[PDB]
Design a protein around this ligand. Structure first.
Ligand SMILES: Nc1ncnc2c1ncn2[C@@H]1O[C@H](COP(=O)(O)OP(=O)(O)O)[C@@H](O)[C@H]1O
Ligand SMILES: Nc1ncnc2c1ncn2[C@@H]1O[C@H](COP(=O)(O)OP(=O)(O)O)[C@@H](O)[C@H]1O
Ligand SMILES: Nc1nc(=O)n([C@@H]2CS[C@H](CO)O2)cc1F
Ligand SMILES: Nc1nc(=O)n([C@@H]2CS[C@H](CO)O2)cc1F
Lengths: 242, 222
C-alpha cells in the first residue's frame, strides 16, 4: 500500500527497540510494530466474551524459556508461534495505523524473514529441529507468505550491527530473565547468519525481491549518545531513497 | 456460492468411501479428501506415525500440520473446479473437528500440555479468522467404535493397526457430544445454525440406497 515498510534487523540486545522507539518520535508519520516477545514469555489465548467478565487472564506458559531450556523439544513449537504472532501484529498495524499520514513509514522490529532464515534455520543447523520439523515449518512459512502477496513485502531493511560481545553485555544490562544463561557461542552463530543475509548478502531465500531490497547497515557498538546523531542522518537519507 | 458440506465421523466410519460414491451423482459435486497421504509422507518423515508412537512429543506438531494441510486443500478447491449450476463441495472433515475433536482429545489425554494447547487454539483462532470455508451443512456418519475398529483392519493402513478400541470410544463420545447431543461448544457462533444430517453407516454397504437419497435431498433444503 502507501505505507513504506522498513524492518529493523539485528541480534538479540543489539539495541533495535531502543533505537527505533526514539527514532520514530522524529515524525508523526512514523510508527513501530514491536516484536511480540512478551507474548512468548507469557503464552495466552483469547478469552470467551462472558468468561472474561468474571475470570482474569492468567499467566500462561513460558514457551521462550522452554525453548532455551530444551531446544530439541521446543524449537519447532516456539518458531511456529513466534512467526504467527509476528505476522498477526504486523498485519493489524498495517491495516489500522498511519491512516491520516502524508508519508507513512511503518518500522517492523524484525521480520518473517529473520524468523525463518536466522532463527529457525540456526535451530535446524543445530539439530534442534529435525528434518520433519524443518520441512513442516518451511511449508507453513511459504504458504502463509504466498497468501499475503505484497502485503508485508519490505521496502527497506536497516541492519543494526553489533558484536556478539556487545549483545551479550546488553542482554545483561536489559536483564530479561530468560536470556540470562545465553552463551556467547549462540549469539555468535546468530551474528554470522545476520552477516551472510544482510552484509555479505550471500544467503539465498525463497523470496526473490529480497535480493534487491535496499539495506542500510548501522554500527551500533558505541554508547548511544556517541553515534545517534549520525545514525539518524543516515536513516533519513536512506528513507528519502525508497 | 459453492455449498460447502463437511462429512464428519470416526476413523474408518466410511467417509471417504461414501463421498467418493456421492461424488458421481452430479458433475456439480466435488470432494476435498482428508490429506492423510501428506501426513504419512511429509514433503519424508511419517508425522502421523510419529504422533501415534510418541503422542506426548508429536501431537502438537501433527495437529498443526494436519489443520494447515486441510485448510490449504479446501481453499485450493474453492479456487476453481466448479461455472456450475448448483455447486457442492464435500469436505472430508473440517477445521472444527481438527480442534474440537482430535486436538481437544489429545489435550484431554495429556498428549498436549497447557502451553501447547494454548498455542494451538491461538494459531487456530488466527488461521481460521483470515481463511470462506464456512459450512452450509454437515453430514455425520455414525458408526460404533467396534465397527470403526473392524474397518480399520479392513483398510489396513499401517499407522493405524495398533489403535485400541478405547481411543475410538473417546473419539466417538466427542463426535456424539458435538453432532448429536449438541453439547459441544465452539467459539464459532454460526455453527449452531448449520443443519446436521446424521446417517447410520454401521451396516454393510448393501443401506446405501436410502443414504444417498437422504443426502441428495438434505442438500435441496440448503
Ligand atoms: N547504543 C547503546 N548504548 C548503551 N545501551 C544500549 C544501546 N542500545 C541499546 N542499549 C541497551 O541495551 C539493552 C538492549 O537494547 P534493546 O533495544 O532492548 O535490544 P533489542 O530490542 O535489539 O533486543 C537495553 O538495556 C538498552 O537500554
Ligand atoms: N458401509 C460399509 N460396509 C462395508 N465396508 C465399508 C463400509 N464403509 C466403509 N467400508 C470399508 O471400511 C474401510 C474404512 O472406510 P473409509 O471410507 O476409508 O473410512 P474413512 O474415510 O471414514 O476413514 C475401507 O476399507 C472401506 O472399504
Ligand atoms: N523467531 C525468533 N526466534 C528466536 O529465538 N528469537 C530469540 C528468542 S526471543 C529473542 C528476541 O530478540 O530472540 C527471536 C525470534 F524472532
Ligand atoms: N486432526 C486430526 N487429528 C488426528 O489424529 N486424526 C486421526 C489420525 S489420522 C486419522 C484419519 O482418519 O485420524 C485426524 C484428524 F483430522
Amino acid at each position: 500500500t502507501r505505507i513504506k515498510k522498513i524492518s529493523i534487523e539485528g541480534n538479540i540486545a543489539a539495541g533495535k527497540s531502543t533505537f527505533v522507539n526514539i527514532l520514530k518520535q522524529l515524525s508523526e508519520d512514523w510508527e513501530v510494530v514491536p516484536e511480540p516477545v512478551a507474548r512468548w514469555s507469557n503464552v495466552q489465548s483469547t478469552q470467551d466474551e462472558f468468561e472474561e467478565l468474571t475470570m482474569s487472564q492468567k499467566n500462561g506458559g513460558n514457551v521462550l524459556q522452554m525453548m532455551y531450556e530444551k531446544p530439541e523439544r521446543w524449537s519447532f513449537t516456539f518458531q511456529t508461534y513466534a512467526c504467527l504472532s509476528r505476522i498477526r501484529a504486523q498485519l493489524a498495524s498495517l491495516n489500522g495505523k498511519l491512516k491520516d499520514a502524508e508519508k507513512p513509514v511503518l518500522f517492523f522490529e524484525r521480520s518473517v524473514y529473520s524468523d525463518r532464515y536466522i532463527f529457525a534455520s540456526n535451530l535446524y543447523e543445530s539439530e534442534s529441529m529435525n528434518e520433519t520439523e524443518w520441512t513442516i515449518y518451511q511449508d507453513w512459512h511459504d504458504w502463509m507468505n504466498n497468501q499475503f502477496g505484497q502485503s508485508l513485502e519490505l521496502d527497506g531493511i536497516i541492519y543494526l550491527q553489533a558484536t556478539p560481545e556487545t549483545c551479550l553485555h546488553r542482554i545483561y544490562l536489559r536483564g530479561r530473565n530468560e536470556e540470562q544463561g545465553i552463551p556467547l557461542e549462540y549469539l555468535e552463530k546468530l551474528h554470522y547468519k545476520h552477516e551472510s543475509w544482510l552484509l555479505h548478502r550471500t544467503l539465498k531465500t525463497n523470496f526473490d525481491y529480497l535480493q534487491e531490497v535496499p539495506i542500510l547497515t548501522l554500527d551500533v557498538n558505541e554508547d548511544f549518545k556517541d553515534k545517534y546523531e549520525s545514525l539518524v542522518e543516515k536513516v533519513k537519507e536512506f528513507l528519502s531513497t525508497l
